[PDB]
Design a protein around this ligand. Structure first.
Ligand SMILES: CCCCCCCCCCCCCCCCCC(=O)OC[C@H](COP(=O)(O)OCCN)OC(=O)CCCCCCCCCCCCCCCCC
Ligand SMILES: CCCCCCCCCCCCCCCCCC(=O)OC[C@H](COP(=O)(O)OCCN)OC(=O)CCCCCCCCCCCCCCCCC
Ligand SMILES: CCCCCCCCCCCCCCCCCC(=O)OC[C@H](COP(=O)(O)OCCN)OC(=O)CCCCCCCCCCCCCCCCC
Ligand SMILES: CCCCCCCCCCCCCCCCCC(=O)OC[C@H](COP(=O)(O)OCCN)OC(=O)CCCCCCCCCCCCCCCCC
Ligand SMILES: CCCCCCCCCCCCCCCCCC(=O)OC[C@H](COP(=O)(O)OCCN)OC(=O)CCCCCCCCCCCCCCCCC
Ligand SMILES: CCCCCCCCCCCCCCCCCC(=O)OC[C@H](COP(=O)(O)OCCN)OC(=O)CCCCCCCCCCCCCCCCC
Ligand SMILES: CCCCCCCCCCCCCCCCCC(=O)OC[C@H](COP(=O)(O)OCCN)OC(=O)CCCCCCCCCCCCCCCCC
Ligand SMILES: CCCCCCCCCCCC(=O)OC[C@H](COP(=O)(O)OCC[N+](C)(C)C)OC(=O)CCCCCCCCCCC
Ligand SMILES: CCCCCCCCCCCC(=O)OC[C@H](COP(=O)(O)OCC[N+](C)(C)C)OC(=O)CCCCCCCCCCC
Ligand SMILES: *C(=O)CCCCCCCCCCCCC
Ligand SMILES: [Zn+2]
Lengths: 124, 88, 64, 128, 171, 165, 122, 459, 71, 174
């Protein structure tokens, strides 16, 4: 079956099935065991894309459309739940843990000139 | 690997030691040459169970395209011999 | 004998080369090896200057 | 009944669950047999040279040569300018270049205003 | 192609492997192996040739729905953890023709025994070609497999690479 | 070893201005740690053997014992030795409700109990119903089967038909 | 966090915001409030190289504990009492900041009743 | 620069007056001696370049390219011995004459002080290069490759000649030292837009710029081994060197004229890397790999920053050693199986263990593994372009991923896997081939220890 | 490799052991429990709790300095 | 001394005296007595041998000093001979200013390591200087481009000075 004559340069090159090389009898004595080809066999136009180190098209236990629904759903729900948890944080009952000397003004790179407005914390 | 080498006779002992616990063959009638269709007429589907027992015994698994061509307790040793490079 | 040979060529000789490199070449230039100044706790004396830091205030502590 | 398997380009239909292997017509048996015929003629030709002892080199593979010749040197003489190639070529060739021009032009035009006016922070920037 | 007899054997062969993957424990495998074994005998005696195919297709379809997503694979098969693990240690036999004489002199006995095989193959080559051409249809061969050795002395045609292939555990 | 790092994290995670869903996910994960650990022990140590008949189950090679032993010693004393020498650099939280201090321990033990029950339930001769939750987790969420089969197909296909030809 | 159910599934006005802790007036309200004193004024803390978050109010305790570790080496099992003292001192600080949480929560509950009275007066 | 020009000329009498069986020995030895003396050009000062006379000078940009040029001729001679074996004596000595006359033009090109003397020698390199491709290439496509290589260069060179003469009439001089002090800013006018294009399009065709590169996959594929080495190691850097010089007299018009050529390079940098993932020819795969790296040099030169120029100079030297090395590797396989298809000879690591070590090191430098000078040059260009526009990190990060994909796919396809059964003539690696790879890789790695001599005038 | 006690791989049966395997294996199993019990005894606070959690419900409005509702 | 102490300041070191409390020995103290005897002393013997050889044949190298020359502002337009010397002098000063920023940066990094956990406070004089020089360096040499020159540096300054005198002039009119 020649490729469609749409003027994309295919010419009279056979259009073999779009099947990966992993979808071949692994036990048949191949002339090229790794490639799973036979000497004198017309090679697929995209043979270099269907080698075993690349795109595979073997049948899957779960239908393609069903897999996409599950994976996206898990990703979609999880992201939504993270947003809910971000705007509703869980914080224990505590106060603004205090620090002395104007809340560590000089320890936190405070500028000695233009001294800060005094801040103090009382016992309780 | 430290796994002891398999001897030509050692394989045969294992092959028959498995066929002798089938509980569907006569131990005194099964020999190195005992066809499963022409000699004692064993069921074809029993070949599948026979081979599966062989595969579960030696570790490696025989192809189905060549498992169907083996009903001869002597041939199994021949096939395994020509698959683990055993010569003595 | 095997350990002594290994502990000599592979430990003692390199630490002579490294130490000679560090002591007389690396440390002759500014800021090649910069240490962290040792922590100074209350009530300690300095080996170099001999200063003494007065201890901290009386602790209003309690048992347990 | 269990849900039927739905194939795709990235997931082929299993051979067992295909209503084309079980039917045994007169054409199928004389067709699946013919494929094995030529497939064996080629293997015989290959086997003769492979096992020959008076040979030291590479067995030329015409199938391999045709594969590479159709991928590099035969594409242009079989190319016709029509409505598909022109449209496919235009948006793959000129498209991205235009798209990346307005992205980088807009970004750098925005940056320049912030630097002339002093609204972009370059306090410690002395490398460029 | 696969004969309808062969398909049932393959379908039965696999169904136990996937079934064995569900049970794990040996005793629970035996209990269900017999049950699945029985379901074949239920329709085994059928001889319609048109309803057996229908069951097989329903059998194949039934197998797919329940097949284990992650079947056990022996670690030397197409999919195991040690498939082609030793392909790098396997080296052709012609590589020894390029050895230096000094390193060839390390094994004086081994290479003397090799020269005999080259003589054995070189002498046998002419007969093997003659055998294949005469025992093959006029229009060319029709299948794989080669004739065995007919007369004494003659060796099976096209035997060199099958006989002298690298070992399965070179090192 | 592990208590001095793992448990001290759940304490800080529980008692922090955190994300509730993230805080929940960690606790569920800790229970899952027990379940697949019990999977290894049960299927690899208990029950009856499933391995082939002729095997060499040998363990007396001196290298193997020595290599395991040192880490075996380290696996017991590493946490105590390290945690009692590294200088303090934070303010660890030591006061908190009872149900938060031990939340790390209850979930893992609870998962341990749950794992043990589910493991034994496989011994019964009741059949199995292939669940989509089972196939989803078995196939790693289908992520290695969509992306690794989709992205290579798109990129490589674009290289030949668009970029080159 | 039991209180979370109140703030997210109850009334938000009564519960205090952890990021908006009491902006209420100064010490007024608690007669004769006592200022919290400090021991390591400026240089003792910036001589043991205490972390910017550790040296809040137990620096004297933390500084004392670090003194024992330096001398007790390699007896890393020693100084246990020193660590316990700092743990207790930190605990009291934890409760003291915890009191402010309940102190404001009830003040919030008190503050709404007066507003409710004015709305319900007519 | 006479101390290097005259020795190079004397190689021609040496080749023709030598014994019929010592042409390869005398030529190789004496060209190596010329290379050793090239290290004297490193007498570089921080303030003033090295000015020899009224015709020739050398600065930090010329020195690394000159030393690279004279180090490549001995390597070309070693690589050409095999396939020029059955060639008759007279034509073999003509082949060496083309190589020497090519080095003679290159060294004078990289040191010409006046910009029209640069043009003459810049264009003079076409003749010897064209003759090597069209006379000693193997395939029937060498003739059409020669025509593509010739007319692409001249279509850009001829407008450049007009632009240079116009500058001399207006400025009064073309001495590069003079232009540094008499340069005036370029006004924005339609006439000045075409002056900019003439001065640059000549150098864009040789880098090459994406779009104008269709000659490179034809010249670099159909040429002999020595043709590919010099084509992809020095001749591509004539355009990059030319741009670095002539951009002095184009400011500030480069601020906006660089936009069309920065987008072609940045997007073309991803098209060329992608094309490598599907190339069915091992030699053509390495050719397209050259367009991707040289796209980084075009971007670096056109944004005119101190970091970009330092990166551009380092990238040019790093690519020359790494690209020439890859061609030699692909040639060694070809000289055995005499075919260029990449999927023909596989699993070669089982039969040629050491030659696969050279494959590994070559690929690591190709994908810019630190701390190689391949990475130093590429990194500096990435740093500079981030300041230009932070979004460029997206495109320069994607190209990094694709670069590692085709670099290691080539390594895996030919070295790993399983060997081809019917290919049985993979003889061991000769000392000539192993030494050829060691003379590419050792200097490439040594430069990592003192990389400041390849960072250019702005170091 | 190593000492190589070379215990023959027995056919269907329990594999052979040695005196060193069990004694050493049992030694560490008892060590784990000894270490687990010894540390649990001395400092059980780390696994159950260090300080009691002060319930704020069982407090008084006076210690907290709440002004009277009557102003 | 090796390097001038003023260029690279270092506050005096204060090593707190040891004060053991435990009865066990300090392993480091004994190692220090084994390192200084089997490593430090043998290395010193070789150095003293090498040092003696140097003193026998002392010879000196001098720090090149550059005579001042007219700046670009004192050169006539298109006067190469006067523009050449002015341009070269500018390039040397650019190199010197690059190293000055390296001296300041080196001092800033040393303070952060020396001061430990209190670096954010004790390192205030260095950081002020680092911001001081970097601002000066940025104005003198930045945005000039790869083909930088004295002329472009002069033009950039004249752009800044004009925008400053205009700003100063119009500030009084506010
Ligand atoms: C969250 C992530 C979940 C994954 C979602 C992506 C799924 C993409 C997809 O489903 O497209 C696959 C596409 C379908 O087309 P297909 O039916 O396979 O081919 C014709 C045969 N009928 O087949 C293709 O690959 C075509 C390209 C699709 C582009 C998307
Ligand atoms: C942008 C222009 C887009 C034009 C799209 C519409 C073109 C069209 O419809 O006709 C083109 C013509 C085919 O004629 P048509 O009427 O379509 O019917 C078939 C009869 N042969 O086909 C022709 O023969 C006329 C030539 C078509 C236009 C060629 C130039 C634009 C398309 C090629 C893209 C080039 C990509 C360059 C990439 C550079 C950047 C890397
Ligand atoms: C300053 C420059 C200093 C270097 C001078 C140039 C070095 C020349 C390189 C060596 C040339 C060479 O290849 O030596 C070859 C020579 C043996 O060659 P030959 O005598 O021709 O063998 C066949 C005789 N029937 O070998 C010898 O005879 C050397 C003994
Ligand atoms: C800066 C930007 C640079 C951009 C460069 C753009 C590309 C430049 C042109 C590349 C030329 C491509 C190579 C020439 C084509 C070729 O290889 O020949 C093909 C064809 C075959 O003809 P021929 O070989 O004679 O006979 C068959 C023999 N088997 O040959 C022919 O049939 C005719 C060949 C035509 C002659 C080639 C012309 C070269 C280009 C110059 C054009 C002249 C200027 C335009 C004329 C003035 C305006 C009218
Ligand atoms: C593909 C098709 C490409 C088509 C390109 C067509 C370009 C021809 C038109 C450009 C003409 C430029 C020109 O003539 O400029 C005139 C200008 C006069 O000089 P002047 O007096 O100093 O100007 C001041 C006036 N107040 O002169 C100047 O000042 C500058 C002159 C510079 C020389 C220009 C060289 C020609 C432009 C080449 C463009 C590159 C195209 C490469 C592909 C070629 C094919
Ligand atoms: C396959 C062939 C490959 C070789 C192609 C050869 C190169 C293409 C020819 C380029 C010609 C130069 C482009 C400029 C044409 C003259 C008009 C011009 O120069 O205007 C300058 C314009 C001034 O105004 P302004 O934008 O305000 O300047 C400051 C901006 N910062 O400033 C500007 O607007 C900036 C310049 C605007 C140009 C925008 C280009 C967008 C498209 C980018 C992809 C290029 C596609 C090439 C076509 C391939 C077919
Ligand atoms: C596919 C097409 C994707 C390209 C779209 C680019 C959009 C440019 C844009 O709008 O800015 C994006 C990003 C935001 O960063 P921002 O600091 O907010 O600067 C605002 C600039 N608009 O602007 C940036 O600062 C660039 C940040 C680059 C992040 C690189 C991440 C690499 C991930 C792969
Ligand atoms: C405090 C926090 C809660 C603590 C309790 C733990 C959480 C509850 C789950 C415990 C049970 C368990 O994980 O079961 C573990 C079982 C065990 O394998 P099996 O398939 O039953 O048997 C295998 C052998 N066969 C086939 C012969 C019977 O696998 C499963 O479940 C499989 C499904 C896993 C995914 C489900 C969780 C993720 C949901 C999100 C969408 C997939
Ligand atoms: C009176 C003024 C006349 C004009 C000027 C001519 C000057 C040169 C004369 C060369 C005479 C000659 O025969 O030169 C020949 C000789 C060398 O021998 P060859 O044959 O090149 O050997 C080349 C080697 N093969 C023969 C093996 C190829 O070269 C010189 O000694 C220089
Ligand atoms: C408040 O901050 C609690 C945070 C802990 C989250 C886990 C809650 C798990 C509740 C399960 C019920 C246990 C009741 C004792
Ligand atoms: Zn050859």
């Amino acid at each position: 079956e020649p490729y469609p004559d749409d003027g994309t340069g295919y010419g009279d090159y056979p259009k073999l099935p779009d099947r990966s090389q992993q979808e071949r009898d692994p036990w048949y004595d191949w002339d090229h065991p790794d490639l799973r080809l036979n000497w004198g066999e017309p090679m697929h136009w995209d043979l270099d894309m269907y080698i075993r180190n690349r795109v595979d098209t073997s049948p899957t236990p779960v239908n393609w459309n069903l897999m996409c629904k599950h994976l996206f759903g898990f990703v979609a729900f999880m992201l939504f739940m993270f947003w809910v948890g971000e705007t509703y944080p869980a914080y224990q009952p505590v106060g603004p843990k205090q620090y002395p000397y104007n809340n560590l003004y000089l320890e936190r790179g405070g500028d000695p000139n233009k001294e800060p407005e005094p801040v103090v914390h009382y016992e309780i | 690997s430290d796994a002891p080498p398999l001897t030509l006779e050692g394989i045969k002992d294992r092959v028959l030691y498995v066929l002798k616990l089938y509980d569907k063959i006569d131990p005194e009638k099964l020999s190195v040459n005992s066809h499963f269709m022409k000699d004692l007429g064993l069921d074809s589907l029993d070949q599948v169970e026979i081979i599966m027992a062989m595969e579960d015994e030696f570790g490696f698994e025989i192809p189905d395209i060549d498992a169907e061509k083996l009903m001869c307790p002597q041939e199994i040793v021949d096939y395994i011999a020509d698959k683990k490079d055993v010569y003595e | 004998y095997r350990h002594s040979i290994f502990a000599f060529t592979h430990v003692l000789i390199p630490v002579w080369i490294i130490h000679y490199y560090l002591k007389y070449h690396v440390t002759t230039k500014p800021y090649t090896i910069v240490e962290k100044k040792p922590r100074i706790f209350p009530g300690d004396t300095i080996l170099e200057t001999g200063e003494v830091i007065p201890p901290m205030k009386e602790f209003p502590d309690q048992h347990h | 009944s269990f849900p039927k398997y739905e194939a795709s380009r990235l997931s082929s239909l299993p051979t067992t669950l295909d209503p084309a292997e079980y039917d045994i017509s007169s054409e199928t048996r004389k067709a699946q047999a013919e494929r094995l015929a030529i497939r064996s003629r080629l293997k015989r030709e290959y086997q003769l040279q492979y096992y020959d002892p008076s040979r030291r080199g590479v067995i030329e593979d015409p199938a391999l040569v045709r594969w590479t010749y159709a991928r590099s040197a035969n594409i242009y003489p079989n190319f016709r300018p029509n409505t598909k190639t022109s449209l496919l070529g235009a948006l793959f060739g000129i498209g991205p270049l235009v798209f990346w021009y307005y992205v980088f032009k807009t970004d750098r035009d925005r940056k320049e205003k912030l630097i002339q006016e002093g609204k972009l922070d370059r306090t410690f920037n002395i490398s460029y | 192609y696969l004969t309808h007899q062969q398909k049932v054997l393959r379908l039965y062969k696999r169904a136990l492997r996937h079934l064995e993957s569900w049970c794990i424990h040996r005793d629970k495998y035996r209990y269900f192996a017999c049950l699945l074994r029985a379901r074949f005998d239920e329709h085994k005696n059928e001889k319609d040739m048109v309803k057996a195919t229908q069951l097989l297709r329903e059998a194949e379809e039934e197998f797919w729905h329940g097949q284990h997503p992650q079947p056990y694979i022996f670690p030397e098969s197409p999919g195991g953890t040690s498939y082609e693990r030793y392909e790098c240690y396997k080296v052709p036999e012609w590589c020894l023709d390029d050895w230096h004489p000094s390193e060839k002199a390390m094994y004086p006995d081994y290479f003397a025994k090799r020269e005999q095989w080259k003589k054995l193959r070189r002498e046998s080559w002419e007969r093997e070609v003659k055998q294949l051409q005469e025992e093959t249809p006029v229009g060319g061969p029709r299948t794989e497999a080669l004739p065995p050795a007919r007369k004494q002395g003659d060796l099976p045609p096209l035997w060199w690479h099958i006989v002298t292939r690298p070992r399965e555990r070179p090192m | 070893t592990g208590f001095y790092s793992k448990d001290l994290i759940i304490e800080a995670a529980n008692t922090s201005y955190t994300n509730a869903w993230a805080l929940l996910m960690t606790l569920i994960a800790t229970s899952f740690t027990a379940i697949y650990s019990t999977r290894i022990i049960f299927f690899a140590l208990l029950g009856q053997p499933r391995f082939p008949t002729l095997v060499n189950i040998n363990e007396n090679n001196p290298l193997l014992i020595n290599s395991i032993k040192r880490l075996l010693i380290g696996s017991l004393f590493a946490g105590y030795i390290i945690s009692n020498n590294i200088p303090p650099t934070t303010i660890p939280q030591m006061t908190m409700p009872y149900y938060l201090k031990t939340t790390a321990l209850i979930v893992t033990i609870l998962g341990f109990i749950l794992a043990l029950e589910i493991s034994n339930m496989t011994k019964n001769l009741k059949y199995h119903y292939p669940s989509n939750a089972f196939k989803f987790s078995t196939l790693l969420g289908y992520f290695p089967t969509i992306m690794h089969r989709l992205a290579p197909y798109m990129n490589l296909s674009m290289s030949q038909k668009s970029a080159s030809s | 966090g039991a209180h979370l159910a109140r703030r997210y599934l109850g009334d938000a006005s009564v519960e205090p915001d952890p990021l908006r802790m009491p902006t209420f007036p100064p010490d007024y309200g608690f007669p004769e409030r006592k200022e919290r004193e400090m021991v390591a004024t400026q240089q003792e803390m910036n001589d043991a190289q205490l972390v910017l978050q550790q040296r809040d109010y137990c620096a004297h305790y933390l500084i004392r504990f670090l003194k024992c570790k330096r001398d007790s080496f390699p007896n890393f099992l020693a100084c246990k009492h020193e660590r316990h003292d700092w743990d207790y001192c930190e605990h009291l600080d934890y409760v003291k900041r915890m009191k402010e949480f309940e102190r404001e929560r009830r003040l919030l509950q008190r503050k709404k009743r007066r507003e409710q009275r004015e709305a319900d007066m007519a | 620069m006479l101390k290097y020009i005259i020795p190079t000329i004397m190689l021609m009498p040496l080749t023709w007056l030598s014994k019929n069986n010592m042409i390869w020995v005398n030529s190789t030895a004496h060209s190596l001696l010329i290379s050793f003396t090239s290290l004297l050009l490193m007498n570089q000062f921080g303030d003033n370049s090295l000015n020899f006379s009224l015709l020739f000078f050398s600065d930090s940009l010329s020195t690394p390219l000159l030393i690279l040029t004279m180090w490549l001729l001995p390597l070309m001679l070693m690589a050409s011995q095999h396939h020029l074996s059955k060639e008759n004596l007279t034509r073999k000595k003509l082949f060496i004459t083309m190589l020497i006359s090519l080095q003679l033009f290159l060294i004078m090109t990289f040191t010409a002080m006046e910009l029209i003397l640069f043009y003459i020698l810049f264009e003079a390199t076409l003749v010897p290069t064209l003759i090597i491709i069209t006379r000693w290439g193997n395939q029937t496509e060498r003739l059409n490759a020669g025509l593509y290589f010739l007319f692409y260069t001249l279509a850009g060179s001829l407008p450049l000649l007009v632009a240079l003469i116009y500058i001399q009439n207006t400025v009064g001089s073309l001495n590069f030292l003079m232009l540094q002090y008499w340069v005036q800013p370029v006004h924005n006018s339609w006439s000045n837009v075409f002056m900019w294009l003439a001065c640059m399009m000549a150098f864009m065709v040789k880098m090459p710029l994406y779009g104008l590169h269709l000659w490179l996959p034809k010249a670099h594929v159909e040429a002999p081994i020595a043709g590919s080495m010099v084509l992809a190691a020095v001749l591509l850097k004539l355009g990059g060197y030319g741009m670095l010089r002539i951009t002095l007299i184009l400011n500030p018009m480069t601020d906006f004229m660089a936009y069309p050529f920065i987008m072609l390079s940045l997007w073309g940098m991803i098209m060329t890397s992608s094309i490598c993932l599907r190339q069915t020819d091992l030699k053509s795969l390495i050719a397209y790999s050259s367009v991707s790296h040289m796209a980084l040099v075009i971007v670096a030169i056109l944004i005119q920053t101190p970091w970009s120029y330092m990166g551009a100079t380092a990238l040019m030297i790093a690519h020359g050693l790494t690209s020439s090395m890859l061609f030699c590797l692909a040639n060694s396989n070809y000289e055995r199986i005499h075919s260029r298809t990449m999927i023909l000879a596989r699993g070669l690591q089982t039969l040629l263990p050491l030659m696969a070590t050279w494959w590994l090191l070559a690929s690591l430098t190709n994908l810019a593994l630190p701390p190689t000078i391949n990475l130093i040059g590429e990194l500096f260009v990435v740093m500079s372009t981030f300041s230009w526009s932070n979004i460029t990190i997206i495109l320069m990060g994607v190209n990094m991923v694709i670069t590692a994909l085709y670099s290691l796919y080539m390594l895996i396809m030919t070295q790993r896997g399983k060997y081809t059964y019917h290919i049985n003539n993979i003889s061991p690696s000769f000392t000539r081939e192993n030494a050829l790879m060691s003379l590419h890789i050792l200097p490439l790695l040594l430069l990592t220890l003192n990389p400041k001599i390849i960072l250019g005038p702005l170091y | 490799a190593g000492g190589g006690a070379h215990i023959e791989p027995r056919y269907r049966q329990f594999p052979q052991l040695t005196r060193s395997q069990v004694i050493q294996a049992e030694f560490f199993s008892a060590t784990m429990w000894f270490w687990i019990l010894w540390r649990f005894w001395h400092d059980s606070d780390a696994v159950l709790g260090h300080f009691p959690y002060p319930d704020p419900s069982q407090w008084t409005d006076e210690e907290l300095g709440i002004p009277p509702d009557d102003e | 001394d090796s390097w001038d102490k003023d260029v690279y300041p270092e506050p005096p070191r204060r090593t707190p005296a040891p004060s053991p409390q435990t009865s066990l020995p300090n392993p480091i103290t004994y190692l220090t007595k084994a390192f200084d005897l089997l490593v430090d002393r043998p290395v010193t013997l070789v150095r003293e041998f090498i040092e003696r050889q140097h003193a026998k044949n002392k010879y000196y190298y001098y720090h090149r000093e550059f005579r001042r020359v007219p700046d670009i502002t004192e050169c006539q337009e298109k006067d190469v001979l006067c523009m050449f010397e002015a341009e070269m002098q500018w390039r040397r000063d650019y190199k010197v200013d690059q190293e000055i920023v390296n001296i300041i940066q080196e001092r800033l990094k040393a303070c952060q390591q020396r001061e430990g956990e209190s670096h954010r406070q004790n390192c205030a004089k260095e950081l002020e200087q680092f911001t001081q020089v970097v601002k000066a360096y940025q104005d003198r040499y930045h945005d000039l481009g790869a083909h930088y020159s004295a002329r472009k540096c002069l033009a950039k300054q004249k752009q800044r000075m004009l925008a400053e005198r205009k700003a100063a002039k119009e500030a009084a009119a506010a």
